[PDB]
Coordinates of C-alpha atoms in Angstrom, one line a residue:
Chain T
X1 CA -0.4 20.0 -61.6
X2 CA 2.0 17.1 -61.9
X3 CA 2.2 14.4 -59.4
X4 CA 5.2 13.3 -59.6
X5 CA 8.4 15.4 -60.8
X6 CA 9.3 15.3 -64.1
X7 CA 13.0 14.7 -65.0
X8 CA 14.7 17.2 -67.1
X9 CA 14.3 17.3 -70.6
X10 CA 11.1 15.3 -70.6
X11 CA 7.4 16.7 -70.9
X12 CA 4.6 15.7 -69.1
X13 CA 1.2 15.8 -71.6
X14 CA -2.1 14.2 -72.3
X15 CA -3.4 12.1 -75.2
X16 CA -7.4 11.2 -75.4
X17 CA -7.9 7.6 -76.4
X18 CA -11.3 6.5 -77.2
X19 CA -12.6 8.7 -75.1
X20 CA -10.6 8.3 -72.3
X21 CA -7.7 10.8 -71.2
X22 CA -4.7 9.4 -70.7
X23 CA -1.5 11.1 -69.1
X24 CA 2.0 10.7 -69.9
X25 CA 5.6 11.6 -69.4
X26 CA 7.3 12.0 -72.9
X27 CA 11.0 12.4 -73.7
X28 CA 14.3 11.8 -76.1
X29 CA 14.2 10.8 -80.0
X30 CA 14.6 7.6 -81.9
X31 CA 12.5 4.8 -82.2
X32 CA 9.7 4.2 -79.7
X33 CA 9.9 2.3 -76.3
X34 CA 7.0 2.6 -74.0
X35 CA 7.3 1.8 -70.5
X36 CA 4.3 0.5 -68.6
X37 CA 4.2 0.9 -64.5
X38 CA 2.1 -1.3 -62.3
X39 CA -0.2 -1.5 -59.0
X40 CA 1.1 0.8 -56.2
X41 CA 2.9 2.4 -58.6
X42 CA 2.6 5.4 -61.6
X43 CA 4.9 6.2 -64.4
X44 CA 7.0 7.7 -61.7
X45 CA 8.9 4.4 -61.3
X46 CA 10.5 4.8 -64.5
X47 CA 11.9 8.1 -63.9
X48 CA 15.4 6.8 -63.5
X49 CA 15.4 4.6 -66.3
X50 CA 14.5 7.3 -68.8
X51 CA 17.0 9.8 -68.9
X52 CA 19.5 6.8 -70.2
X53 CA 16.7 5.3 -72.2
X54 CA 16.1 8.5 -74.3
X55 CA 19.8 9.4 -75.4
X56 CA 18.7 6.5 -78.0
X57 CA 14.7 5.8 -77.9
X58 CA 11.8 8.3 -77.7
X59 CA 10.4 7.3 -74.4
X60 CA 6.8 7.4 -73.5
X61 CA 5.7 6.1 -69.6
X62 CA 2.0 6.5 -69.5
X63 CA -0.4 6.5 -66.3
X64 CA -2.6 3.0 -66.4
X65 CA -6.5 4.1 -67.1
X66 CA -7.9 5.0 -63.8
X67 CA -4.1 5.6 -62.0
X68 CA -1.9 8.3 -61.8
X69 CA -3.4 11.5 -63.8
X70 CA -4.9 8.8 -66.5
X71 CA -8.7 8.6 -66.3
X72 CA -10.5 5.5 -65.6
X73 CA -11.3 2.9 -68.6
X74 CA -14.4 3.5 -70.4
X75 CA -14.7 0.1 -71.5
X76 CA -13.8 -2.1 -68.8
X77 CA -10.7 -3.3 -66.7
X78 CA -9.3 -6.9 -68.2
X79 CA -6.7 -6.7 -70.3
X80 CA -8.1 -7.2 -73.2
X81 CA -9.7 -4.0 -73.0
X82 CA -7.1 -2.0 -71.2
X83 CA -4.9 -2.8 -73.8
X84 CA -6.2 -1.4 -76.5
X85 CA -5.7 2.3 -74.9
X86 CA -2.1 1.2 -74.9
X87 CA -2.0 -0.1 -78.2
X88 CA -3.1 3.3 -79.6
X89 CA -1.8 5.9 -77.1
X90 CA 1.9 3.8 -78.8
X91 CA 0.6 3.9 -82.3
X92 CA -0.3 7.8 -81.8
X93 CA 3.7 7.9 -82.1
X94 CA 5.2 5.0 -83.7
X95 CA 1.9 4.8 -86.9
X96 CA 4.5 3.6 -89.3
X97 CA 7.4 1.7 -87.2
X98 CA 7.1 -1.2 -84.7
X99 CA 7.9 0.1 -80.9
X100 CA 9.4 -1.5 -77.8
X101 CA 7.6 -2.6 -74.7
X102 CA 8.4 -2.9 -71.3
X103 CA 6.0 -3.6 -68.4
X104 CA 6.0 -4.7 -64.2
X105 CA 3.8 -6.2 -62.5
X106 CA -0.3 -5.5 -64.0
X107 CA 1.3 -3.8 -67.2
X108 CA 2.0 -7.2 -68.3
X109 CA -1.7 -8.0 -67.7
X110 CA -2.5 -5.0 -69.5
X111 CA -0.2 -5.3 -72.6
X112 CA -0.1 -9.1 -73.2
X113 CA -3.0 -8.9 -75.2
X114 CA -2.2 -6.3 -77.9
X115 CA 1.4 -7.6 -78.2
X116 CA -0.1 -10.7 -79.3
X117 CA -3.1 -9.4 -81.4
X118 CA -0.6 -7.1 -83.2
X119 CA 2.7 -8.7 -83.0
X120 CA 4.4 -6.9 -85.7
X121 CA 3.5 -3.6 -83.8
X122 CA 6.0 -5.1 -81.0
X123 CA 9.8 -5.2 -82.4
X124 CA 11.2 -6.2 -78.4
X125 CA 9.7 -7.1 -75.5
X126 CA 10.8 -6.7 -71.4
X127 CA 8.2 -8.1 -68.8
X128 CA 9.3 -8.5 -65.2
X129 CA 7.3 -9.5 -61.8
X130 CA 3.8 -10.6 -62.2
X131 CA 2.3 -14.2 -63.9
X132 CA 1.0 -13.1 -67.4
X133 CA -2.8 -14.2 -66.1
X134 CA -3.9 -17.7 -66.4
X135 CA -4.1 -21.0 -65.3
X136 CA -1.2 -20.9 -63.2
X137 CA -1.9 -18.0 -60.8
X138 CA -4.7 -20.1 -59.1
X139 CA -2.0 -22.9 -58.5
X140 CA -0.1 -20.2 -55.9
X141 CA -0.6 -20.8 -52.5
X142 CA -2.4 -18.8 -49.9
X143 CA -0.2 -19.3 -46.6
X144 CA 3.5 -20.4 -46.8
X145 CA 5.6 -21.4 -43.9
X146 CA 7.3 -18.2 -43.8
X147 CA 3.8 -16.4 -43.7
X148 CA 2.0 -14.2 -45.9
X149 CA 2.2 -15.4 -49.6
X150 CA 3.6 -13.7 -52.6
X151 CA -0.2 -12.8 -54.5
X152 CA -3.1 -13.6 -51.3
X153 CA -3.8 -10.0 -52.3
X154 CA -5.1 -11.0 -55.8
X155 CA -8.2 -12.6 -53.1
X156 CA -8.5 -9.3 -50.9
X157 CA -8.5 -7.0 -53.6
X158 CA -11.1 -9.2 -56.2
X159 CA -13.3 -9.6 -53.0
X160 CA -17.0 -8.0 -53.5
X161 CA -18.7 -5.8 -51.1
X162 CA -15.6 -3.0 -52.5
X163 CA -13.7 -5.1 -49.3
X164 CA -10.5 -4.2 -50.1
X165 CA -11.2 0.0 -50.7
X166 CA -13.8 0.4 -47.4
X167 CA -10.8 -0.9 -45.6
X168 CA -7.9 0.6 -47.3
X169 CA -10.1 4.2 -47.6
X170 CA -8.4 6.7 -45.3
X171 CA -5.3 4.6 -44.4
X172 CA -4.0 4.2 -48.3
X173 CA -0.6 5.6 -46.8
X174 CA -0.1 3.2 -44.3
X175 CA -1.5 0.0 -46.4
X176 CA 0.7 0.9 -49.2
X177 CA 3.8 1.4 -46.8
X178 CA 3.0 -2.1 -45.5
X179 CA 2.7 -3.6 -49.4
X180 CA 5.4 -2.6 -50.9
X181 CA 8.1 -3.3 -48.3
X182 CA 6.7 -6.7 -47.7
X183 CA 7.3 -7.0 -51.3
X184 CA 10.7 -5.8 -51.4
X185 CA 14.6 -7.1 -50.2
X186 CA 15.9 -3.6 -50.3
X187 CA 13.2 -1.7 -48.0
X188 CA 16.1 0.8 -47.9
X189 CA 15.0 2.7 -50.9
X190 CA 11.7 3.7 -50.1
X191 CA 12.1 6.1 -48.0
X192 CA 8.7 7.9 -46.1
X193 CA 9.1 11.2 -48.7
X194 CA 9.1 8.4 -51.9
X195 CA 6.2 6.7 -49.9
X196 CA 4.3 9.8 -49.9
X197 CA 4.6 10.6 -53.5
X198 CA 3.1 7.1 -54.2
X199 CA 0.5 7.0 -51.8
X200 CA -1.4 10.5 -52.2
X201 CA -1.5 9.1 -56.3
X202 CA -3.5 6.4 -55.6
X203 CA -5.4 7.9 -52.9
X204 CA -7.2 9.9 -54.5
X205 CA -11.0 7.5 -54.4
X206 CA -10.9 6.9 -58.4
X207 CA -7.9 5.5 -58.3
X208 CA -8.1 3.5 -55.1
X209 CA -11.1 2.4 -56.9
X210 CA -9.3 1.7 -60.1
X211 CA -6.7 -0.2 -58.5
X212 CA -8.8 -2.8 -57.3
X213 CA -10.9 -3.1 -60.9
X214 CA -7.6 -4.9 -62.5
X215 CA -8.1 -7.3 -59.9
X216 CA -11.8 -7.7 -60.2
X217 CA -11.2 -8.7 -64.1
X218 CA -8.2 -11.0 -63.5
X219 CA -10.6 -14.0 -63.9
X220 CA -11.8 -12.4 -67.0
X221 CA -8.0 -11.7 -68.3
X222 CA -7.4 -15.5 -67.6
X223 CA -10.4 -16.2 -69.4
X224 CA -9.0 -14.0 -72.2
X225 CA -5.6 -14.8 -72.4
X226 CA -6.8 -18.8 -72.7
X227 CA -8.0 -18.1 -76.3
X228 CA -5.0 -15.6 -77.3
X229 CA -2.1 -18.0 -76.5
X230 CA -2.8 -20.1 -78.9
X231 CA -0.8 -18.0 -80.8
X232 CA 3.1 -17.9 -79.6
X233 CA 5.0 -14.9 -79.3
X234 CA 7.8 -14.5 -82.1
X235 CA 9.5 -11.4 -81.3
X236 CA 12.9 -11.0 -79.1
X237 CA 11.4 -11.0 -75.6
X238 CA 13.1 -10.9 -72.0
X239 CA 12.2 -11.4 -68.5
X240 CA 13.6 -10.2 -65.6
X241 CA 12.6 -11.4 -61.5
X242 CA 14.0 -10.5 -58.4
X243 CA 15.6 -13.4 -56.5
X244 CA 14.9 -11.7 -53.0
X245 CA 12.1 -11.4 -50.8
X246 CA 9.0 -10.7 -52.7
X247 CA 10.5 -11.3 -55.6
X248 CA 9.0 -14.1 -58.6
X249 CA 11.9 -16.1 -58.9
X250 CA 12.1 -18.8 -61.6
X251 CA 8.5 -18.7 -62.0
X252 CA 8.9 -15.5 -64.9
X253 CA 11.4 -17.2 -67.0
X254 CA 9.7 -20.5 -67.0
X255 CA 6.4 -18.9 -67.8
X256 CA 7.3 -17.1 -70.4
X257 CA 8.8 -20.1 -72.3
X258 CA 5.6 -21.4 -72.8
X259 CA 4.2 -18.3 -74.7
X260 CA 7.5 -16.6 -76.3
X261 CA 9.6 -18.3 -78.7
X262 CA 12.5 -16.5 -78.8
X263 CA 13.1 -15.4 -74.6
X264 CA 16.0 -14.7 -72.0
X265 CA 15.4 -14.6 -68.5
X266 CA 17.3 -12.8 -65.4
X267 CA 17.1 -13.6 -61.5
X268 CA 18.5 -10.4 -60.1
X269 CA 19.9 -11.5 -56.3
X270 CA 19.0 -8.9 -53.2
X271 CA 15.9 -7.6 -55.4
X272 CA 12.5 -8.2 -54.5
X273 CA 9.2 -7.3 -56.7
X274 CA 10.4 -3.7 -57.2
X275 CA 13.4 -3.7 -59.3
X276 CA 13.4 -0.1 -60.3
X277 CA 14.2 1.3 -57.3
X278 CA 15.5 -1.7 -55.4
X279 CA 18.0 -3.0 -57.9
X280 CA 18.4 0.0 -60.4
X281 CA 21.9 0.1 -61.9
X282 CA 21.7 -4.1 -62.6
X283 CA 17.8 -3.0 -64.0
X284 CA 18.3 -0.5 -66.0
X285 CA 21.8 -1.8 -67.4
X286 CA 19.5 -5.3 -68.7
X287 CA 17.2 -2.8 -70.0
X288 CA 19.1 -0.9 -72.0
X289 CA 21.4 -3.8 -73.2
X290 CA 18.8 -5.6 -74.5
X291 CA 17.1 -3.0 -76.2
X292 CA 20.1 -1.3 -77.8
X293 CA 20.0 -4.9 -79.8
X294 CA 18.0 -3.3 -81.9
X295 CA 18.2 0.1 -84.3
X296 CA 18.4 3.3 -82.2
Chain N
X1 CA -22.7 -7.0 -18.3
X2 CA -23.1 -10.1 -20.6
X3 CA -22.1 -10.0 -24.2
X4 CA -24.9 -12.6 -25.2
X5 CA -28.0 -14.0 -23.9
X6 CA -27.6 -16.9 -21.5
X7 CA -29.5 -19.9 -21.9
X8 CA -31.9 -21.1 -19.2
X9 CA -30.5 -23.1 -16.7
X10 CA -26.7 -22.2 -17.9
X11 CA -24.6 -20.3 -15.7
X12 CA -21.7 -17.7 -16.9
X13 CA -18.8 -17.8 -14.7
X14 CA -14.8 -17.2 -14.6
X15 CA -12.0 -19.6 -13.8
X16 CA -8.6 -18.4 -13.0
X17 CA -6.1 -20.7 -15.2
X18 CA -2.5 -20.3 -14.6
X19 CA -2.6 -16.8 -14.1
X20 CA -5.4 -15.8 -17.0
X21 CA -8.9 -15.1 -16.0
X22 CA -10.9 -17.5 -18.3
X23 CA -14.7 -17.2 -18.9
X24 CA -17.2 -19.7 -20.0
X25 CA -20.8 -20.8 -19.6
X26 CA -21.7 -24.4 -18.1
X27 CA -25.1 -25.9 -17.3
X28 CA -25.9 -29.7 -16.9
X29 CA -25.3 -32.6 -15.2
X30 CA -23.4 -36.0 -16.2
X31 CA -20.1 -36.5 -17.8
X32 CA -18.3 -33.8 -19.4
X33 CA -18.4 -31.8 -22.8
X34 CA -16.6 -29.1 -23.9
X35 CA -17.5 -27.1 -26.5
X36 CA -14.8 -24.8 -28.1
X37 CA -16.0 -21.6 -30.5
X38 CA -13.3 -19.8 -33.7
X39 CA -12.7 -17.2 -35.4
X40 CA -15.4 -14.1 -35.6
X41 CA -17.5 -16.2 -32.7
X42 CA -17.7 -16.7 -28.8
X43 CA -18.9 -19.1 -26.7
X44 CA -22.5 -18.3 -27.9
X45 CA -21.7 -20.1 -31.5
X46 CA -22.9 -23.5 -29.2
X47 CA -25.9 -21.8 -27.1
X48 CA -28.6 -23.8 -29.3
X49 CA -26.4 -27.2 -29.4
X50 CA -25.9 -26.3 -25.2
X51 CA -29.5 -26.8 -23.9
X52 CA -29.9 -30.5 -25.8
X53 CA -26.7 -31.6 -24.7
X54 CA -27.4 -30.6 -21.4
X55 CA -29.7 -33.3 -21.0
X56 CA -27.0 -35.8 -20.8
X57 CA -24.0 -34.3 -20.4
X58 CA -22.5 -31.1 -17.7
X59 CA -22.0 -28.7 -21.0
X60 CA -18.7 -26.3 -20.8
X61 CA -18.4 -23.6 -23.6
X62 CA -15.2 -21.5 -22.8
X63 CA -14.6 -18.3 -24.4
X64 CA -10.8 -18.9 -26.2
X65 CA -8.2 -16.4 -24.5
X66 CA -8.2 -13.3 -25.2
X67 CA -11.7 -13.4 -27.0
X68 CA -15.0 -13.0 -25.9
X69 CA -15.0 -12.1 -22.0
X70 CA -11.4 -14.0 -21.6
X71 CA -8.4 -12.4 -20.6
X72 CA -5.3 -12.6 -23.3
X73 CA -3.0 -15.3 -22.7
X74 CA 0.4 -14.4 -20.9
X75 CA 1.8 -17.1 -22.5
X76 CA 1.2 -16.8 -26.0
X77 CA -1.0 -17.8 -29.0
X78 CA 0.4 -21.1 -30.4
X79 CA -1.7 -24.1 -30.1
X80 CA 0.4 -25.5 -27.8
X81 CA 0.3 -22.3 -25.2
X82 CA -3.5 -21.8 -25.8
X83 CA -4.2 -26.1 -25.4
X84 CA -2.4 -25.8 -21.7
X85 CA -5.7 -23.0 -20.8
X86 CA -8.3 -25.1 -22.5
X87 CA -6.8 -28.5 -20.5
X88 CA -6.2 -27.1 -17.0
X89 CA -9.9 -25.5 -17.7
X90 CA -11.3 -28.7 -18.4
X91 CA -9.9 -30.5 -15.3
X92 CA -11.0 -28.3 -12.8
X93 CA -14.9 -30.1 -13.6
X94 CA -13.7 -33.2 -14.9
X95 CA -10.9 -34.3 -12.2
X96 CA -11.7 -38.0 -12.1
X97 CA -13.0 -39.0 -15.5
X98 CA -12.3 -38.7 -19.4
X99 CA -14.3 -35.6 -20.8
X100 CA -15.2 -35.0 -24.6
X101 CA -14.3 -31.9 -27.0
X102 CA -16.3 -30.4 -29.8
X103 CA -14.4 -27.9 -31.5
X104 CA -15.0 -25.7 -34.8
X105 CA -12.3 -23.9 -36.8
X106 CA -9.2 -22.7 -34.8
X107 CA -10.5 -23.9 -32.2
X108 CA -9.0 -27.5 -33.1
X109 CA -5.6 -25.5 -33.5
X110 CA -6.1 -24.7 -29.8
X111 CA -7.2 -28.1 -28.6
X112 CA -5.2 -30.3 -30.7
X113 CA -1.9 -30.2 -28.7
X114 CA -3.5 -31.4 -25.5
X115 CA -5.5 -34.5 -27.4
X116 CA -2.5 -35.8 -28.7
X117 CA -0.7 -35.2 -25.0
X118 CA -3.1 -36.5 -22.8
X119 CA -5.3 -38.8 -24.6
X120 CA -6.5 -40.5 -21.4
X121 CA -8.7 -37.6 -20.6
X122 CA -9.9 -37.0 -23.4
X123 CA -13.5 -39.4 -24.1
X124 CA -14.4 -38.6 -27.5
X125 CA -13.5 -36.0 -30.0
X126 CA -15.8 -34.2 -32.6
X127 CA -13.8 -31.8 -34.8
X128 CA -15.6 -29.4 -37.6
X129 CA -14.8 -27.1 -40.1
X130 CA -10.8 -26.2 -39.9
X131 CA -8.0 -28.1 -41.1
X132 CA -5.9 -29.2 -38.4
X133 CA -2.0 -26.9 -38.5
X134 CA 0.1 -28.8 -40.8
X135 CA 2.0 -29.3 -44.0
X136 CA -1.6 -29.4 -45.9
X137 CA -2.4 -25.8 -45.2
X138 CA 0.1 -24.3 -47.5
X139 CA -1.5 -26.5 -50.5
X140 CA -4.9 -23.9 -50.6
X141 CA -4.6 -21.3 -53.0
X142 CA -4.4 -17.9 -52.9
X143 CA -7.2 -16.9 -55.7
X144 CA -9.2 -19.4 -57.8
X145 CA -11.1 -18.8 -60.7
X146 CA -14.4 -18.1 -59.4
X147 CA -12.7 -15.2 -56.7
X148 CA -11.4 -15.0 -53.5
X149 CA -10.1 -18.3 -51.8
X150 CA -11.1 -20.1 -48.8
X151 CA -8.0 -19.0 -46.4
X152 CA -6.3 -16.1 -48.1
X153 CA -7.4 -14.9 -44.8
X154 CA -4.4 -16.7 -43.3
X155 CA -1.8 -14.5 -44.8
X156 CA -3.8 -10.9 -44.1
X157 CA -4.7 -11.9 -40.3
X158 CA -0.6 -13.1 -39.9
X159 CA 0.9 -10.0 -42.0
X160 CA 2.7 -8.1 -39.2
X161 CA 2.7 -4.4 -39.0
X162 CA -1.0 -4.8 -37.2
X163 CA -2.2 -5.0 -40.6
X164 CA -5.3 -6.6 -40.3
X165 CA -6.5 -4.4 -37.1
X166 CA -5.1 -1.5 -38.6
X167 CA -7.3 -1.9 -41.8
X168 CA -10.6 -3.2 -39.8
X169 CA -10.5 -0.7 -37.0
X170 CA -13.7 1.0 -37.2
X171 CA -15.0 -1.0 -39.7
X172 CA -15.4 -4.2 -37.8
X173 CA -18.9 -5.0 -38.2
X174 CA -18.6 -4.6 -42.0
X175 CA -15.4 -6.7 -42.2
X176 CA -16.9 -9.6 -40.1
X177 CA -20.5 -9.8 -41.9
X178 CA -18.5 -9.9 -45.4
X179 CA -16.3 -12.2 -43.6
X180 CA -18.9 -14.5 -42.3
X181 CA -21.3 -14.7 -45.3
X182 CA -18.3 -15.0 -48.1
X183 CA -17.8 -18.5 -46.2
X184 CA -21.1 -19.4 -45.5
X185 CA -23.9 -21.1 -47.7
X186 CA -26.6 -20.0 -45.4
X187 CA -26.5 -16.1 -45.1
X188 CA -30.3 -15.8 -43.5
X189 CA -29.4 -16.8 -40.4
X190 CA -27.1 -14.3 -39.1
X191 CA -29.5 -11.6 -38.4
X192 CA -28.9 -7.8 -38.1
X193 CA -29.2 -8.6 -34.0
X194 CA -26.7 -11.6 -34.2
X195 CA -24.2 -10.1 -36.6
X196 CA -24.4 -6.8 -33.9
X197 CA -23.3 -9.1 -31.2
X198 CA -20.8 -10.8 -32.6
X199 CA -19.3 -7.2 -34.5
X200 CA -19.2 -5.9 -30.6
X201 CA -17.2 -8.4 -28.8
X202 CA -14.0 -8.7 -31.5
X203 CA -14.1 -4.9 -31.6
X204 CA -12.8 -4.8 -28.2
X205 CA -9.2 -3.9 -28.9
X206 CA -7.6 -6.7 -26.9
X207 CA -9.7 -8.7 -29.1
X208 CA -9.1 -7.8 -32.6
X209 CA -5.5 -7.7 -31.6
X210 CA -6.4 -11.6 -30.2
X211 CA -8.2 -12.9 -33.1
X212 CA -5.2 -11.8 -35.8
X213 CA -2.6 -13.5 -32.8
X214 CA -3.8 -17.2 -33.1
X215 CA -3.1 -16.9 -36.7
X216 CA 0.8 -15.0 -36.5
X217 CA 1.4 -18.1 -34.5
X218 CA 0.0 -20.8 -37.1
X219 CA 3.7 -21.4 -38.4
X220 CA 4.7 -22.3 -34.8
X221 CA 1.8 -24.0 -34.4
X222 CA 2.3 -26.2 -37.5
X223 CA 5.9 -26.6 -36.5
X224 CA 4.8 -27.7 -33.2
X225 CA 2.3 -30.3 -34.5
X226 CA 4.8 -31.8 -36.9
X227 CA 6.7 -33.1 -33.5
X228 CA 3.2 -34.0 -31.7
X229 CA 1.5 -35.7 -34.6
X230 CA 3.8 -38.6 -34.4
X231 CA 1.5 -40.3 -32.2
X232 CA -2.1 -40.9 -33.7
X233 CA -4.9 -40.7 -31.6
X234 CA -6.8 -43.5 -30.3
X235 CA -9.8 -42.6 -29.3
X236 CA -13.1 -42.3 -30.6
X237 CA -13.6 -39.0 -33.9
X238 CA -16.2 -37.3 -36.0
X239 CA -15.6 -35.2 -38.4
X240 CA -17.9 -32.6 -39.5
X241 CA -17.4 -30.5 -42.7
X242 CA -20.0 -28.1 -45.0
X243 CA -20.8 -29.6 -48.4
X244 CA -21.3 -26.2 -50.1
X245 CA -20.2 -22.5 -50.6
X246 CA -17.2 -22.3 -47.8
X247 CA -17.4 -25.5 -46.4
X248 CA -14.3 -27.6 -46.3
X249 CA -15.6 -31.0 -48.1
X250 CA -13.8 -34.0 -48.1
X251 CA -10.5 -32.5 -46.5
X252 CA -11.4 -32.4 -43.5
X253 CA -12.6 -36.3 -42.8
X254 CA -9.3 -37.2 -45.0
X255 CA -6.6 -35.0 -43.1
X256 CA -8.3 -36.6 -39.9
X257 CA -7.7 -40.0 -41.3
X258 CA -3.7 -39.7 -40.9
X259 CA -4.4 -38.4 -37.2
X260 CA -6.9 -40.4 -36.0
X261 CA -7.4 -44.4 -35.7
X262 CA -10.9 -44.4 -34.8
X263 CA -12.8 -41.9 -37.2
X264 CA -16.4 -41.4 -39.0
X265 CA -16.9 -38.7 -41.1
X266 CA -19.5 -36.2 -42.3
X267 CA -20.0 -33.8 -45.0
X268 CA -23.4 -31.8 -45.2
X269 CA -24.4 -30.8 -48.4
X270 CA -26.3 -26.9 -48.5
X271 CA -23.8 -26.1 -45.4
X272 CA -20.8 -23.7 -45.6
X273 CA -18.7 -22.7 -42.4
X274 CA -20.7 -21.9 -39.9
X275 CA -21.9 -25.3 -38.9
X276 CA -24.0 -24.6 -35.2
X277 CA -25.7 -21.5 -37.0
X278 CA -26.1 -22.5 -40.7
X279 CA -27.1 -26.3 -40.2
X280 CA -27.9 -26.1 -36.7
X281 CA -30.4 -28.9 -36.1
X282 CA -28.5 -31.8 -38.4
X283 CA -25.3 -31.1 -36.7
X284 CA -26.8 -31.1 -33.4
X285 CA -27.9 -34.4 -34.1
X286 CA -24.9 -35.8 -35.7
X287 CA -22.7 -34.4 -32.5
X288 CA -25.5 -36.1 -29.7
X289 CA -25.4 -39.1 -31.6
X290 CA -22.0 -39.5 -32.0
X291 CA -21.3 -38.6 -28.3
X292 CA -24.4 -40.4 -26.9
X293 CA -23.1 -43.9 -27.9
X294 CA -20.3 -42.8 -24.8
X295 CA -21.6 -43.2 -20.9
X296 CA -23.6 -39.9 -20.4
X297 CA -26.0 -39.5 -18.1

């Protein structure tokens, strides 16, 4: 059973990592990029990037632990820990040769880690839309004169008492409408059948649950990440933000610049936080520019 | 069929205010207080602080529109729309004379536009526990590192698509006790009994729907204070503000200080949010005193 369809060419498989099963959608030849989806979201957002992606990279877009067809983390939910199932799952593939990375939203959280624990594992680098955790995200503000603010759900969903899934249980379809077009400048492209796809993923109660978990350990990540940045990042990395509603703005680029040495940085106009589907011809064109720097 | 106990000697009644069937609960004699209730509460947040100031004062605790056993307002939500109800209230017992006004959490939003407008009727002002709509409430956070903020809250109750009653429909008992004790220091005193009460009258459709309303109008209502705050007030204010675990500290005595001329301020340490409940018998006495040193009777 697939959740999401699978575009042609491509396979859809599992790989067990330290005990944990973790599902993925596979295709093309060349060196490694793996793409890494984030919350509301599966592999499935990557599924029109891929195709143009694997006529000169093998392409691998894996579930998060816990999401999608992936099983939960055995370990535990920061990223420290998460990332190590990445780290592997990518190694399983590239053992010999350095692989490219790119990540929205909590893939960052969950990659930062082994990209800077294993740096010569990472030959580029594309983050876009979410802080990298630390210091900074408590400095966002709850309630902004145009209403609800860009991350008050990092509260709601770290809340104890399992706030966030007693109330989302049962009405995941309508909560996840409700967060990902206030999040978005182009509502246009997600359509009630694309909506559907999404939500019946993440409604199923692990992965409701597992949503939330990330959020739980953001404190921890932060915690994490304080010790790990003392380290810069020295491979070619870039950023991308949406310059619409919901999207980051400035805030990715200048970021970054205090953990990557070597880093370029987009504001995509009319795009929110879901540039895949909002903004995907400027997206994917970035993408694949800035990867095809390198030997393919 | 009453939604809380009455106290002895206190009355529940309904006046009609321009249009909108407003209830409250009165007893005493002497000049006049009112007593306004927030967010999660009624009217029956003040029923132990009611019976010792009814000693000296004719005690008013209305239940805000739309919540409780008030109609909605057919005006709207801002603080300047709700303050019109409260006022017009007020001055059908105290006609002839200056009256003072307690208030806790949005209940200032919905009281301060008729201080600042008519500050000849209003005696003495006791505000606690909610910063008053302004600038200052888009500097809180959204997370900090120890968990979910003090007003995140803002941004779910205001997000439009009926989110918030759409998510706490038919969980509303569980949503307000998490609510109420992640703000509170205290947690013992809101009984199984109490937090039943409470859980019943914002589950009321019009209600939920009510509560969530006062805070998709807190951008107006901070747009509206920026024109109103130009004139300070003048007379007499206390401050009153939990010390730990969800109490606002030191903001709210230092936001009053660019409002208010004449102020005094408290913080009480071992209190969070829920000031009449959690640290009932020190803010009793702080409110009495403060309002005693006034003509009462």
């Amino acid at each position: 059973a697939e959740e999401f369809p699978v575009p042609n060419g491509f396979e859809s498989a599992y790989r067990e990592v330290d005990g944990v099963k973790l599902h993925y959608v596979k295709g093309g030849q060349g060196p490694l990029v793996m793409l890494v989806h984030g919350f509301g979201q599966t592999w499935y957002e990557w599924h029109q990037l891929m195709p143009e992606l694997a006529k000169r990279f093998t392409v691998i877009a894996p579930d998060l632990p816990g999401l999608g067809q992936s099983e939960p983390p055995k370990t535990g939910y920061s990223g420290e820990q998460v990332a190590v199932y990445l780290h592997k799952l990518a190694r399983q593939f590239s053992p010999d040769r350095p692989f490219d990375l790119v990540a929205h939203d909590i893939g960052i959280w969950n990659t930062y880690p082994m990209v800077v624990k294993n740096q010569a594992d990472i030959a580029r680098l594309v983050y876009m839309q979410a802080p990298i955790p630390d210091a900074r995200i408590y400095r966002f503000p709850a309630f902004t004169a145009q209403g609800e603010s860009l991350v008050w759900h990092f509260s709601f969903f770290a809340a104890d008492d399992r706030l966030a899934e007693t109330l989302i249980a049962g009405k995941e379809r309508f909560f996840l409408e409700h967060f990902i077009k206030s999040h978005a400048s182009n509502t246009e492209v997600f359509s009630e059948r694309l909506l559907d796809l999404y939500a019946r993923s993440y409604a199923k109660p692990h992965s409701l649950n597992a949503s939330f978990e990330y959020y739980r350990a953001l404190n921890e990540s932060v915690r994490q990440n304080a010790e790990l940045a003392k380290t810069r990042l020295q491979m070619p990395t870039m950023t991308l933000a949406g310059g619409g509603h919901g999207g980051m703005g400035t805030f990715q680029l200048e970021q970054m610049k205090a953990y990557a040495e070597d880093v370029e940085g987009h504001v995509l106009p009319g795009c929110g936080h879901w540039l895949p589907e909002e903004c995907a011809a400027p997206m994917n064109r970035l993408v694949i520019d800035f990867l095809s720097r390198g030997r393919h």
